[PDB]
Amino acid sequence: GSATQSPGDSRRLSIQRAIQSLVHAAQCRNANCSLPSCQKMKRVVQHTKGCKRKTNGGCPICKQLIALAAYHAKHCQENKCPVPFCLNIKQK
Amino acid sequence: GSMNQPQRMAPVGTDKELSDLLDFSMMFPLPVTNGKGRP
């Protein structure tokens, strides 16, 4: 009757949803979405594709995105993966 | 009260980026990435 799950489990679902939005927006360049998550995520994903500033250090926004993708890249060896970070972490 | 409402996106550059960063910071937990000297 709690439905709170174990602390590690509950934080795992929520963190995976963040990754699933990064995966969504990496594949998603369509205008057919009107939800807030997709709008901010496509904003930052198309940004990270045109952002040399992230490896140049002066961009904390992409530091968040690479943190999801790093943890995710430890488990995911996918060479066809939508997320550009995920490859650039586990390949290099 | 409650008149003013936050705008959808901005061409300012950096203020809009930290606003993006905010949405994501609340979207995921992640590790605290600190030792954290708090109860």
Tab-separated table of C-alpha atoms in Angstrom:
chain	number	residue	atom	x	y	z
A	1	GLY	CA	0.000	0.000	0.000
A	2	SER	CA	3.111	2.271	0.069
A	3	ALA	CA	3.946	2.117	-3.720
A	4	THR	CA	7.109	4.161	-2.930
A	5	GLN	CA	9.439	1.294	-4.078
A	6	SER	CA	13.048	0.907	-2.840
A	7	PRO	CA	14.998	4.324	-2.896
A	8	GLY	CA	17.405	2.888	-5.544
A	9	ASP	CA	14.476	1.550	-7.668
A	10	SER	CA	12.295	4.756	-7.537
A	11	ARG	CA	15.294	6.994	-8.519
A	12	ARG	CA	16.161	4.452	-11.298
A	13	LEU	CA	12.728	4.818	-13.075
A	14	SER	CA	12.839	8.662	-12.908
A	15	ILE	CA	16.514	8.786	-14.156
A	16	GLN	CA	15.669	6.334	-17.036
A	17	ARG	CA	12.738	8.645	-18.092
A	18	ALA	CA	15.298	11.497	-18.375
A	19	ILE	CA	17.423	9.263	-20.679
A	20	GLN	CA	14.270	8.233	-22.658
A	21	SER	CA	13.617	11.994	-23.276
A	22	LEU	CA	17.275	12.419	-24.466
A	23	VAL	CA	16.737	9.370	-26.755
A	24	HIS	CA	13.326	10.737	-27.908
A	25	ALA	CA	14.623	14.240	-28.776
A	26	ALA	CA	17.819	12.847	-30.461
A	27	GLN	CA	15.559	10.981	-32.959
A	28	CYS	CA	12.819	13.690	-32.816
A	29	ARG	CA	13.135	16.705	-35.143
A	30	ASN	CA	9.355	16.605	-36.014
A	31	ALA	CA	6.928	19.467	-35.140
A	32	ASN	CA	4.099	16.906	-34.357
A	33	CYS	CA	4.911	17.052	-30.567
A	34	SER	CA	3.484	19.919	-28.420
A	35	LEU	CA	4.481	18.518	-24.933
A	36	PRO	CA	6.891	20.652	-22.669
A	37	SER	CA	9.458	17.819	-22.120
A	38	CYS	CA	10.032	17.410	-25.888
A	39	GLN	CA	10.234	21.197	-26.532
A	40	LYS	CA	13.013	21.866	-23.943
A	41	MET	CA	14.777	18.553	-24.745
A	42	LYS	CA	14.849	19.122	-28.575
A	43	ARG	CA	16.070	22.676	-27.795
A	44	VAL	CA	19.071	21.321	-25.833
A	45	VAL	CA	19.678	18.247	-28.137
A	46	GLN	CA	19.917	20.347	-31.375
A	47	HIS	CA	21.985	22.770	-29.213
A	48	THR	CA	24.454	19.956	-28.136
A	49	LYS	CA	24.923	19.094	-31.845
A	50	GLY	CA	25.963	22.760	-32.481
A	51	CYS	CA	27.799	23.204	-29.091
A	52	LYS	CA	31.644	22.972	-29.161
A	53	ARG	CA	31.453	24.968	-25.860
A	54	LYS	CA	30.583	21.735	-23.945
A	55	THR	CA	34.086	20.165	-24.458
A	56	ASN	CA	35.492	23.749	-24.157
A	57	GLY	CA	34.163	23.566	-20.544
A	58	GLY	CA	31.879	26.647	-20.379
A	59	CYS	CA	28.453	24.911	-20.715
A	60	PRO	CA	26.912	23.124	-17.557
A	61	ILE	CA	23.678	22.274	-19.520
A	62	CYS	CA	25.512	19.701	-21.684
A	63	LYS	CA	27.369	18.563	-18.494
A	64	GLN	CA	23.959	17.333	-17.207
A	65	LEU	CA	23.115	15.573	-20.522
A	66	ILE	CA	26.537	13.806	-20.724
A	67	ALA	CA	26.012	12.621	-17.064
A	68	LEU	CA	22.767	10.695	-18.064
A	69	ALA	CA	24.481	9.408	-21.219
A	70	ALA	CA	27.669	8.341	-19.309
A	71	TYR	CA	25.844	6.215	-16.683
A	72	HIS	CA	23.676	4.867	-19.565
A	73	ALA	CA	26.809	4.189	-21.784
A	74	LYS	CA	28.267	1.940	-19.018
A	75	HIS	CA	25.357	-0.516	-19.667
A	76	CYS	CA	24.691	0.353	-23.371
A	77	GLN	CA	27.339	-0.635	-25.998
A	78	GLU	CA	24.899	0.327	-28.807
A	79	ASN	CA	26.810	1.658	-31.882
A	80	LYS	CA	23.480	2.756	-33.500
A	81	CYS	CA	22.430	4.666	-30.323
A	82	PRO	CA	20.497	8.034	-30.945
A	83	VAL	CA	22.420	9.866	-28.146
A	84	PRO	CA	25.715	11.399	-29.615
A	85	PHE	CA	27.308	11.616	-26.100
A	86	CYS	CA	26.719	7.878	-25.365
A	87	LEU	CA	28.969	6.786	-28.265
A	88	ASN	CA	31.595	9.546	-27.701
A	89	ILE	CA	31.927	8.319	-24.046
A	90	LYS	CA	32.216	4.491	-24.582
A	91	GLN	CA	34.141	4.714	-27.959
A	92	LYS	CA	36.873	7.221	-26.915
B	1	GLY	CA	-1.220	38.593	-7.226
B	2	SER	CA	-0.119	35.664	-9.486
B	3	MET	CA	-0.341	38.031	-12.534
B	4	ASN	CA	3.177	37.458	-13.990
B	5	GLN	CA	3.757	34.126	-15.852
B	6	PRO	CA	7.208	32.652	-17.021
B	7	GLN	CA	7.770	32.946	-20.830
B	8	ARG	CA	8.151	29.896	-23.133
B	9	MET	CA	11.871	29.915	-24.227
B	10	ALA	CA	14.085	33.087	-24.713
B	11	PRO	CA	16.719	34.456	-27.274
B	12	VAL	CA	18.907	35.841	-24.379
B	13	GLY	CA	21.327	32.881	-24.695
B	14	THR	CA	22.501	32.017	-21.142
B	15	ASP	CA	19.410	32.832	-18.951
B	16	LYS	CA	17.338	30.495	-21.166
B	17	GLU	CA	20.106	27.807	-20.902
B	18	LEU	CA	20.032	27.790	-17.038
B	19	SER	CA	16.196	27.649	-17.364
B	20	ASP	CA	16.662	24.511	-19.601
B	21	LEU	CA	19.171	23.138	-17.031
B	22	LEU	CA	16.505	23.696	-14.321
B	23	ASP	CA	13.854	21.543	-16.191
B	24	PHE	CA	16.400	18.720	-16.560
B	25	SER	CA	17.770	19.002	-12.967
B	26	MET	CA	14.181	18.315	-11.656
B	27	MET	CA	13.507	15.693	-14.455
B	28	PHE	CA	16.237	13.310	-13.084
B	29	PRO	CA	17.670	12.610	-9.553
B	30	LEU	CA	21.226	11.346	-10.430
B	31	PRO	CA	23.995	11.069	-7.738
B	32	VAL	CA	24.588	14.336	-5.784
B	33	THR	CA	28.220	14.241	-7.199
B	34	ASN	CA	29.403	15.556	-3.777
B	35	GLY	CA	30.359	14.142	-0.343
B	36	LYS	CA	27.327	16.080	1.028
B	37	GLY	CA	27.815	17.238	4.666
B	38	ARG	CA	24.021	17.488	5.275
B	39	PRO	CA	21.429	15.391	7.363
